[PDB]
Amino acid sequence: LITDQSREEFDILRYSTLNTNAYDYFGKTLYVYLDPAASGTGVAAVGAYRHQFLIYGLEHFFLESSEVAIAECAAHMIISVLSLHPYLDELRIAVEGNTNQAAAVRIACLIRQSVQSSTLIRVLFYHTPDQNHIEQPFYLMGRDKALAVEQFISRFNSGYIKASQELVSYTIKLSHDPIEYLLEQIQNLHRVNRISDDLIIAVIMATYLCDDIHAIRFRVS
Amino acid sequence: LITDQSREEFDILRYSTLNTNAYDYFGKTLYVYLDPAGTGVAAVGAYRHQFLIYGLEHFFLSESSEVAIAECAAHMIISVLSLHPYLDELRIAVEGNTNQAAAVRIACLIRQSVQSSTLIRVLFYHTPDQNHIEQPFYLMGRDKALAVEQFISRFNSGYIKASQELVSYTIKLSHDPIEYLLEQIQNLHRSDDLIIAVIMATYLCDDIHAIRFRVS
Ligand SMILES: [Mg+2]
Ligand SMILES: [Mg+2]
Ligand SMILES: [Mn+2]
Ligand SMILES: [Mn+2]
Ligand SMILES: [Mn+2]
Ligand SMILES: [Mn+2]
DSSP: OOOHHHHHHHHHEEEOGGGOSOOTTBOSEEEEEEEOOOOOEEEEEEEEETTEEEEEEEEEEOOOOHHHHHHHHHHHHHHHHHHHOTTOOEEEEEEBOSSOHHHHHHHHHHHHHHHHHHOOOEEEEEOEEOTTSOEESOBOOSTTHHHHHHHHHHHHHTSOEEEEEEEEOTTTTTTSOHHHHHHHHHTTOOOOOOOOOHHHHHHHHHHHTTSSTTTTTEEEO | OOOHHHHHHHHHEEEOTTSOOOOSSBOOEEEEEEEOOOEEEEEEEEETTEEEEEEEEEEOOOOOHHHHHHHHHHHHHHHHHHHOTTOOEEEEEEBOSSOHHHHHHHHHHHHHHHHHHOOOEEEEEOBOOSSOOOBSOBOOOTHHHHHHHHHHHHHHTTOEEEEEEEEOSSSBTTBOHHHHHHHHHTTOOOOOHHHHHHHHHHHHTSGGGGGGEEEO
């Protein structure tokens, strides 16, 4: 399914971002995605380097309002990633509103609040047309899922997704190695009972939406 | 000559060997080379079909000329094996083109420094001379060209990489060992004593070289 060799490499080879002053080959766009949800919240923040993908942040979160914390957990990850990578100059963010578009709306709003208080930046959100035929800041996930998974798998096995040394994770880092933790969940992927899959799904997606195809669904919030 | 990328990537891609606990495709064997007099030493191993640098030394030289050279080489090694327990054998080549005899003393001294300090199989590269005496040194001739060609070809293709925590005692704290070798890499056209040590180490990792290594 997913090759031991591809997994190993993912583990023992991470990109030493803080080693160079030559940024001329990395992205400048941080792309982030979050699965909200007994269950857990997944957050992944990725960017490009040459023709490859760099994971800069992972959160997986368990539980005053669910919604205020969820927002704050993610805003915290972004302001730290951004801090460590000054070549970044734009945030493209996608919030899965799949079980409750209502809540996810506020969560978008809240994240932007937090981030822009901290730091000066472009902040766009994944905007999809609602029921009154009107654009909102949530991702409704569905028929793409399959392509997205079958894409990562392949991208993964060929070594295109790489972690960074200085990857930020305030939820996972004090208990596990973000990356080994992630692997336990990649190890668990299947094509299409008790298997929290929220971290990996968040990764997969945050990697799929970076294309040109979706370059326009992101829009000033 | 060498890509602006293959450098850039060397700088920012290093093996983090201690999150893994497989070592299923890790080179158990560690290859070491040294060029005597600037003197240069390189500890090198294999990952799958690619190479890693584990350790690096450029030492400048009070008497007992051969003892310092060897003692320095040895310290690196024991530091390096201590960090990578999967390492279980040792293939050391000691260049000797000025004096061949002094090459052989340095050989035997390194041998003693290690086996005193740790229990491990240790082979040296051998070469016949006047009397057909298979003697524990490597003589470096027409191959330099070849070996270096292979190296360019390998390094551009991204197969020669560094361990994120690699040993250097002779270098590390006013210079970064990686940046330090890297400046010597931008020099090569087919002083330089370190990179030659690197070029040779990797070169000797090849199966076609195995029988030349024996128990000293
Ligand atoms: Mg640098
Ligand atoms: Mg591991
Ligand atoms: Mn979900
Ligand atoms: Mn979920
Ligand atoms: Mn020499
Ligand atoms: Mn020399």
